[PDB]
Amino acid sequence: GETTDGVYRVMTRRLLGSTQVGVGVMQEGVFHTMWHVTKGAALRSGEGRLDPYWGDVKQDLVSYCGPWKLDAAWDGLSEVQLLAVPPGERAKNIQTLPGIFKTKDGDIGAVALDYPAGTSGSPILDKCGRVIGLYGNGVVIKNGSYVSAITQGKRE
């Protein structure tokens, strides 16, 4: 199937019509998405099949055809862009200054942008166009707003 680098929608025909369940990144021959989008199932790309290679429910990440390749990190100071891919809508860049998730195991950048659940897996990029993580695993705060962690995997 299509192996070209870029951002892709993850679709299913299991529900009514064709439904977008999430989004992912093809980089260096590896497909990267959040675990909650595919639940670790195999994927189709045209007539080809993409098998899972690595995954972790706690990190909420999964890679297909090879190991996780994304290793850029938010610098902790600069604005980033969410490359949002919403269901039935064109890919669109949104610039924002991340907030922070403070945890007992360290701090993580977080983006306070609210999109439909099917946008999960959309990439967050730095000014060099490098993917610093995936959008779609986060929390609902006091005033009811959604804040996503900038979730990034480890490149072995």
């Binding site: 870029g6 675990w35 189709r44 669109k92 610039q95 403070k102 007992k104 942008l113 929390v139």
Partner: protein, 39 residues
């Protein structure tokens, strides 16, 4: 049966729409990968 469809290139857009605040939150991450607020 899940399938993928290309949606675009990954590139920074000059003059993209700029929005969103930057909240600083204390959170906890459980074994199922769910984040929750710590108050």
């Amino acid at each position: 049966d899940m399938y993928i469809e290309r949606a675009g290139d990954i590139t920074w857009e000059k003059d993209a729409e700029v929005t969103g605040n930057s909240p600083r939150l204390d959170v906890a991450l459980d074994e199922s990968g769910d984040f929750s607020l710590v108050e």
